Design a protein around this nucleic acid. Sequence first.
DNA 1: CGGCCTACG
DNA 2: CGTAG
DNA 3: GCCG
Length: 327
Amino acid sequence: WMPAYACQRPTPLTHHNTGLSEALEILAEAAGFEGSEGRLLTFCRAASVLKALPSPVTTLSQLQGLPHFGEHSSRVVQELLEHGVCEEVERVRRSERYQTMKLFTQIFGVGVKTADRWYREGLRTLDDLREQPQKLTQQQKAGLQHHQDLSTPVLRSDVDALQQVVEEAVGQALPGATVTLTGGFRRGKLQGHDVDFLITHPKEGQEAGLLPRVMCRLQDQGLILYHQAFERSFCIFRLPQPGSWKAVRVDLVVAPVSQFPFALLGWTGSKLFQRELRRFSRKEKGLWLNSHGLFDPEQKTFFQAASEEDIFRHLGLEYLPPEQRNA
DNA sequence: CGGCCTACG
DNA sequence: CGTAG
DNA sequence: GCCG
Ligand SMILES: [Mg+2]
Ligand code: NA
Ligand code: NA
């Protein structure tokens, strides 16, 4: 009844099993901190299955037959239903390792492998990292410098202000170029931790060289605190606020218009949705999907898509609008 | 047994 | 390695 | 951890 791939089922933003999914996602995150991407994926997938259910799970029997629920994920739900807590989840939550790995990997520029090395070296707090700055990349220095602001929710009012200044810079750099809001905000989220924009031009080839021109124009307006030929720019903007400013993470992506449906699909997410869609494409349909195109490795050809709907159709999938891709 | 998404900076 | 969805 |  419940399809096994997340791209085969609608997942709305608001759902009925948040307590259960959040517990499984703690175990997924902890699996990642220990270097087990496979266990992370299973727990992510199991959490996502619960997000797609039409009603609250109140009895363990409601799990029978569900994909990605085996002995371990079922026991977690069982304990939560019977007792309101899962001992394993609580042990993880309270552990110094989990808390510190979460603290460090939430820094922009720091992933699991870097966080784990620092943990093994005895580091535990952000001030510990600040006390040893030669051990930081430029990206990490920027992540730590702006960490307070980057932990503040980005609101819709911020998104609208950012879209205006990005549209102004893009228009100065290339008349006729367009700016599309992607990421979680396109899926209907009201808050986020960053803002994602996709930039193109209707005439194929005119977007060559656009992103450096856009960045130069934003920097000369004093809008850029941090950035790295290129097509993805991971920025920190100086966003004006009444009497002051705050740092905000902004991603700017350029795509030629021939690739725009693929980039729009990829950058709209969710992350799990897109991993599942790429897995489905290759494993079930024998086609290779990324944010540039959909490749048939037998014919050695690329699928010409005019819309996201075209891509779903070519993959034999029922179309899902962005607000149902919240896997 | 062995895969688990697939890119760019 | 980091980043992204 | 789950499954093809
Ligand atoms: Mg985002
Ligand atoms: Na990080
Ligand atoms: Na982003």
